[PDB]
Design a protein around this nucleic acid. Structure first.
Ligand code: DGT
Ligand code: ZN
Lengths: 431, 381
DNA sequence: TGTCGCTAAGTTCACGCAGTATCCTGT
């Protein structure tokens, strides 16, 4: 009722980049090449056996994460030697470690501990005293290098916190120099109103897709939300798989006129899918022979290449997860986004939030960020935004539905080699 | 015959009588297999008992030469080896192996001493030779019927017995184990001088034993009951009594006190045994113990065994080891066998036909017929 | 019928020495 009678349909709630006309048109995915970013590491494309984590394996994965990031930072900063975190230090020493909270609550400036890696510290921890640090921004699981002293052997006092070093951007090949600008419409779940299971917002978005004919449509989960009031109280008369199959059929068949490449990203809130992160792609739907080349069932997180433009995307609410734990000396979202980019992982928070199941071997294998993406799609319960963080266009399109009321989606234009202005324009628009 | 005259006659014989052409035909086996004659082992025994082995020759000419040069007292034929025996020193250790040889049997009258009464040790007479006459028939029949060996050369050993050379290609490729199996199959009289009962047949008579007893029966009456007279007096028939269960022994003794002829005593023994049934084969066990051939399994088991060559000269009797015609076996007489002295007298009394003028000719003829059969088998095959 | 020398690393085979395994003999 409330959604159907909305009056702000099509309103542009946020804008960035070159001004464009009131109407956006795309190439219908004609001269479009969508693939997974070809990096050294193989992508997650199939289910991996889970529910069996050895504490030793978790220890090894965390330790190697710290060690690898510290090695890269040491080469970049020309640091001579790292020192064990636990040992006393009367003079200033450089220490590599990861941040954490001394208790189970939320991190605060008086509860910070630094845990070293196995190579340099035997995994030992030390309390941290942030009284002598003038400026800082710390979240649990953050790999840091600090110059400080430990006079009592019991409390590390940092004096310098080395800044993060983001990965270099992608240097596109000339193969896509002559390709036109590409239009991407991105939306995130939930796709149905809190009190309905009819997917009205999804129908409106599909109508928008057919109207504007974008080159890529990135749909992020959930598609059958686990927190939907109907799902939790067991009022559904059909199986979860059937509802999800109906939703996917609606999406794929309804986009036939647009000829738009669909990129489907699962969510941890998908009640019908495996609850593990990194999430494998959906595998319960077989597109018809006429839609096989258009539909891309990708994994969470995903690094996509679109005519040379690298788009990073994750369904996980990274900003909400890290905002609850980040502590700063004095834009918060920009700081968190820079933290994500500099840590070079799509989920650097450790321990994770209570709402995400992390398989740490898969996390090690499939969460490293190959490069710094040209566009980074990070849907969040927080407010929509389009930010420029260290040259990367971070887009939060919100969620298509916000409770009983309609939500928002985003549309942006990407061209490889433009001007670094790989993102010509971007807009958060209302549904 | 004067054995001091042996060194005088040996050369002439080896020069003008020893049948070298047929000998090479034999040991060369139609040239089918290369190096067959060239890998054959020979051994020579010279004057003053000097023994040499690992002698091999390239062809008939070399053999004739080295033999006429050495003038050996004994010639033994051995195995065909993997290489030439003459170069056995040159062959790497373990790589010198005996590979093929005729299957051979040696039957020696001396092994019958505990059961013959006319002679002893190396003495033979017409009364005991029938034992050999039996053996050749008993064995050769088996070799022609049970095993299917088709080329069999029987040769007089010169003094105490006979040898058999079974030369079928199959018989020449038999392993040691197969040879031992063949020997044990043919062998019935088992035991030494310390055993009295050497034959213990089972309830079932194996067909081979039935056919050997059938062959024995034809001769038994003449050999044992007429000639040998194995029941002449108590000192001898005590043995045969010793070969049967004690239960009837007394019953027999009184009967043997009223019998005048050993044929009568045999009839009485057979009747008494028949009256007494598991012992129904006891007379057969006695016949076998007095008539069946004795075989030294060591002679036939080993591939590397050196056996007296045909047409050798016996160092003591001087007789020639002549082949025996199977058909005319009943006419064979080991005392009429040509001696070397007789055939040298015959030779010095008148090129490739000199031997046809001696008494050696019919035996070379039998050998030539045997070699002709071997050639027919080599061709037809 | 004469075909220069020695020195040295290297391959392929033939054997010691020791260790592991499986397969035997008879009536
Ligand atoms: N018998 C013999 N000896 C040789 C041969 N080649 C080399 N040599 C020996 C004897 C030479 O004096 C010695 C020196 O060898 P070199 O290859 O250094 O050449 P050489 O010193 O004669 O002259 P060079 O180094 O070119 O100024 O090696 C050869 O072919 N036969
Ligand atoms: Zn006699």
């Amino acid at each position: 009722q409330k959604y159907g009678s909305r009056t702000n349909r099509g309103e542009v709630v946020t804008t960035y980049g070159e001004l464009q006309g009131t109407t956006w048109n795309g190439g219908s995915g004609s001269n479009t090449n969508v693939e997974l970013f070809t990096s050294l590491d193989e992508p997650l494309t199939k289910m991996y056996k889970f529910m069996f984590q050895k504490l030793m394996d978790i220890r090894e994965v965390v330790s190697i994460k710290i060690e690898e990031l510290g090695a890269s930072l040491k080469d970049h900063f020309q640091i001579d030697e790292f020192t064990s975190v636990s040992l006393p230090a009367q003079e200033t020493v450089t220490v590599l470690g990861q941040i954490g909270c001394d208790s189970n609550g939320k991190l605060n400036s008086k509860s910070v501990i630094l845990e070293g890696d196995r190579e340099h510290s035997a995994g030992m921890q030390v309390p941290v005293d942030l009284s002598e640090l003038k400026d800082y921004s710390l979240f649990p699981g953050q790999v840091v290098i600090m110059e400080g002293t430990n006079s009592t052997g019991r409390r590390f006092v940092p004096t310098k916190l080395y800044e993060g070093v983001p990965l270099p951007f992608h240097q596109p090949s000339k193969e896509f120099e002559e390709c036109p600008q590409q239009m991407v419409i991105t939306a995130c779940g939930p796709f149905t109103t809190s009190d309905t299971i009819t997917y009205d917002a999804l129908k409106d978005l599909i109508d928008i897709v057919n109207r504007d004919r974008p080159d890529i449509c990135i749909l992020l989960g959930p598609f059958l939300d686990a927190k939907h009031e109907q799902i939790e109280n067991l009022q559904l008369t059909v199986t979860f798989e059937d509802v999800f199959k109906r939703c996917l059929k609606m999406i794929i068949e309804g986009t036939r006129p647009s000829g738009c490449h669909l990129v489907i990203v699962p969510s941890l809130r998908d009640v019908h899918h495996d609850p593990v992160y990194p999430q494998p792609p959906f595998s319960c739907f077989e597109p018809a022979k006429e839609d096989k080349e258009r539909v891309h069932f990708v994994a969470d997180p995903c690094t996509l290449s679109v005519n040379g433009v690298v788009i990073g995307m994750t369904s996980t609410d990274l900003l909400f997860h890290m905002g609850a734990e980040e502590i700063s000396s004095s834009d918060r979202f920009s700081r968190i986004l820079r933290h994500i980019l500099t840590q070079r992982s799509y989920y650097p928070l450790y321990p994770p939030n209570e709402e995400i199941n992390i398989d740490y071997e898969a996390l090690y294998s499939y969460t490293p960020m190959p490069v710094t993406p040209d566009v980074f799609i990070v849907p969040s319960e927080l407010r929509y935004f389009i930010k420029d963080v260290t040259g990367c266009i971070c887009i939060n399109p919100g969620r298509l539905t916000k409770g009983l009321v309609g939500g928002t989606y985003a549309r942006f234009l990407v061209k490889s080699g433009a001007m670094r202005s790989t993102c010509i324009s971007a807009q958060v628009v209302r549904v | 015959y004067d054995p001091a005259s042996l060194p005088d006659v040996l050369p002439l014989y080896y020069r003008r009588l020893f049948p070298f052409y047929q000998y090479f035909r034999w040991l060369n086996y139609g040239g089918v297999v290369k190096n067959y004659f060239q890998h054959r082992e020979f051994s020579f025994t010279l004057k003053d008992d000097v023994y040499v082995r690992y002698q091999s020759f390239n062809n008939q000419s070399e053999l004739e030469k080295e033999m006429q040069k050495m003038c050996p007292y004994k010639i033994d034929i051995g195995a065909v080896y993997s290489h030439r025996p003459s170069l056995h020193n040159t062959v790497k250790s373990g790589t010198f192996q005996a590979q093929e040889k005729e299957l051979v049997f040696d039957i020696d009258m001396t092994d019958y001493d505990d059961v013959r009464r006319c002679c002893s040790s190396a003495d033979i007479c017409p009364k005991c030779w029938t034992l050999m006459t039996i053996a050749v028939r008993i064995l050769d029949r088996a070799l022609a019927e049970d095993f299917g060996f088709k080329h069999r050369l029987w040769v007089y050993s010169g003094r105490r017995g006979v040898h058999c050379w079974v030369c079928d290609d199959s018989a020449r490729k038999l392993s040691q184990a197969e040879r031992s199996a063949v020997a044990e199959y043919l062998s019935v009289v088992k035991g030494g001088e310390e055993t009295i009962k050497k034959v213990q047949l089972p309830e079932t008579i194996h067909p081979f034993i039935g056919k050997s007893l059938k062959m024995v029966e034809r001769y038994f009456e003449k050999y044992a009951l007429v000639d040998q007279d194995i029941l002449e007096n108590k000192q001898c028939w005590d043995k045969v009594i010793a070969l049967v269960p004690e239960v009837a022994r007394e019953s027999l003794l009184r009967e043997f006190s009223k019998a005048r002829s050993s044929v009568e005593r045999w009839d009485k023994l057979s009747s008494c045994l028949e009256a007494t049934r598991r012992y129904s084969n006891i007379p057969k066990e006695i016949m076998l113990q007095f008539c069946y051939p004795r075989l030294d399994v060591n002679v036939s088991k080993g591939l590397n065994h050196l056996l007296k060559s045909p047409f050798s000269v016996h160092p003591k009797t001087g007789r020639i080891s002549v082949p025996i015609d199977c058909k005319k076996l009943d006419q064979f007489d080991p005392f009429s066998v040509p001696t070397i002295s007789l055939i040298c007298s015959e030779l010095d009394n008148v090129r490739t036909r000199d031997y046809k003028r001696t008494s050696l000719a019919p035996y070379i003829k039998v050998f030539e017929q045997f070699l002709d059969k071997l050639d027919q088998s080599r061709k037809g095959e």
